[PDB]
Amino acid sequence: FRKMAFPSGKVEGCMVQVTCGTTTLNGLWLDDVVYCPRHVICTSEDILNPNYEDLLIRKSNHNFLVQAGNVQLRVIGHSMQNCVLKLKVDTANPKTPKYKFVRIQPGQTFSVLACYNGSPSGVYQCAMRPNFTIKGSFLNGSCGSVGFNIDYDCVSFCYMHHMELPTGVHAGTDLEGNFYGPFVDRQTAQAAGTDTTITVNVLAWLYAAVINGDRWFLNRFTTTLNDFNLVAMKYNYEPLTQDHVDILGPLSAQTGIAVLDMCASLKELLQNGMNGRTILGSALLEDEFTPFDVVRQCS
Amino acid sequence: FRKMAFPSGKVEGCMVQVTCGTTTLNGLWLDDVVYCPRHVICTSEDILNPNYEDLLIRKSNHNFLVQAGNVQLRVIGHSMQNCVLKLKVDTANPKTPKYKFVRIQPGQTFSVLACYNGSPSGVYQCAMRPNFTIKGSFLNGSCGSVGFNIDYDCVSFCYMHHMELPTGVHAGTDLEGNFYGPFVDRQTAQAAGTDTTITVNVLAWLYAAVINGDRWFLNRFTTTLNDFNLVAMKYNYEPLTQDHVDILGPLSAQTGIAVLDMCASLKELLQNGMNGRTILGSALLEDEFTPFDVVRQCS
Ligand SMILES: COc1cccc2[nH]c(C(=O)N[C@@H](CC(C)C)C(=O)N[C@@H](C[C@@H]3CCNC3=O)C(=O)COP(=O)(O)O)cc12
Ligand SMILES: COc1cccc2[nH]c(C(=O)N[C@@H](CC(C)C)C(=O)N[C@@H](C[C@@H]3CCNC3=O)C(=O)COP(=O)(O)O)cc12
């Protein structure tokens, strides 16, 4: 049981390279539109406090150079939706999969296709933390890389990458240009709210540990939902809802461990620690696996 | 720092399914040849102790159903190479990338595209252990899934999946059909050799830490290679090779820390312990990042 990303071929066929002036980043080419972060129009001066509608009315179609591999697409239009620039081109991408723009909830996961200069570099799995950051791996030139899920040949795009906080975590927008969290596309050191642990995902990952024949953390005891949430909130874990309990049903049915039983296990793990032992190789409680993540891998 | 797979699109376009009787597994379609595990020709009463040579003589080209999606590709030739079947087909795969077949060393990492009935399911990075096993995530129907590295648009295929040992780790061959490690393609419980820690990768991980300003573990001593290797084996660490010293070159030059000085630093860490202090946020030493992996995620 490992962190597993969706195959990235369908998104790879859409990554292009967008240049305005002296700056370059990645864009997403679907049908005849290219989507990219709008601060690609900005200069070193502008970046500190950009008045984007002002900067954009002064740009022309010919100020944008879009490259798909070695061929250049001609831009025939440009508009701005929140933080994303939409560049119309005179060519439809034949590799455009069935797709949808969606806004992810905190706790949900997606695959990130890291790109540099319109070339895909790597793929890995991330979760939207409760404080609307993600713990990614991105360098200079990765802006415009997207996050996505795949559901029966439909690619749901949910993330476009914009910045790296001083603490080394990452921030970005949905494909409608709206940031996840309180961040802004201006060149400033920004801080996020206090992060908390995704409780439903820790539980799913304990269930995963048992599906793979590991059980040392189990115990005989049980807890009520409310009493687990009291201890949980004490340790900066998100609350567990009855919806979460329902979602975990399959995992409980498969292993024969009721949810509130597994909660009693996690409570004791929080109150006492791991005592040097490890779960699925990890020395810390993992919270970047959704219950759907677990079932899809184990079956 | 994240475990990061290569983008999987060039390999996705090469995945097909190969059916003999009622057993279906995955195959790899490059130019006009399909590669797959030979035990696809086995019946459930044959897998215990197959006579592959005798089994193959009774097979004809029309006993083999090769499908890209639900589209059939006609088999026009067949032959066996160690444990892989090679099926010549009547169509050259137009999505064939520039490619190589290569045999990796323990410690090297690679990306696995987990496939079922010729359809990609997921992608993740594995390291080849010193006992020639990989810590995979595979279900029934996964045999013939391949592992690969991509360097400058050329795909180097290094693994084809065959087996899950009773301990839950996995085993397979290179693309010429030679098993990694002492295993055989028969339906029997086989045991891996005792595993050890991949020393070259731990050192890579120490260089990563230094690059990020975490360097308390650096010391004023050096060692000879042989002296380090003798000590390393007493701690269940792999001995260093001359090639290992060579692939630490870039990290050594970038940090100004000589390889044998970093060995002396690691050697003190083995004799004395971490004393509660951490490295890159952790109390255990990571051994599944290669020196190329570190260079990739730092630059
Ligand atoms: C003084 O201000 C600061 C103080 C302290 C911390 C700070 N952090 C940022 C920031 O992150 N700024 C965004 C651009 C703003 C305008 C939204 C950025 O730099 N994004 C990168 C991806 C980043 C690059 C490194 N790792 C990534 O993930 C692009 O890809 C585009 O820029 P490039 O063309 O590649 O250089 C500003 C800042
Ligand atoms: C009774 O003997 C045993 C005792 C104890 C442990 C044992 N383990 C194996 C084994 O692994 N046997 C190979 C068959 C070959 C080696 C002849 C196999 O089962 N390979 C799977 C991949 C596996 C499936 C689950 N997770 C994977 O990685 C395929 O994909 C092909 O088989 P399928 O037709 O797809 O089911 C036999 C065995």
Numbering used by the authors:
A (entry chain B), B (entry chain A): 3 to 301
Please quote the authors directly.
The main protease (Mpro) of SARS-CoV-2 is a salient enzyme that plays a vital role in viral replication and serves as a fascinating therapeutic target. Mpro is able to cleave the bio-synthesized viral polyprotein 1ab (pp1ab) at 11 specific sites to produce a variety of mature non-structural proteins necessary for viral replication and transcription. Among these, PF-07304814, also named lufotrelvir, is a highly soluble phosphate prodrug of PF-00835231 and a first in class 3CL inhibitor to treat SARS-CoV-2 infection.
The prepared samples were successfully crystallized and the crystal structures of PF-07304814 in complex with these Mpro mutants were solved to 2.29-Å (G15S), 1.95-Å (S46F), 2.05-Å (M49I), 1.75-Å (Y54C), 1.97-Å (K90R), and 1.70-Å (V186F) resolution, respectively. Though four other substitutions, namely S46F, M49I, Y54C, and V186F, situated nearby the binding site of PF-07304814, no significant changes were found in the orientation of PF-07304814. The binding energy between wild-type Mpro and PF-07304814 is -9.2 kcal/mol. The binding energy values between PF-07304814 and these Mpro mutants are − 8.9 (V186F), -7.4 (G15S), -7.4 (K90R), -6.8 (S46F), -6.6 (Y54C), and − 6.3 (M49I) kcal/mol.
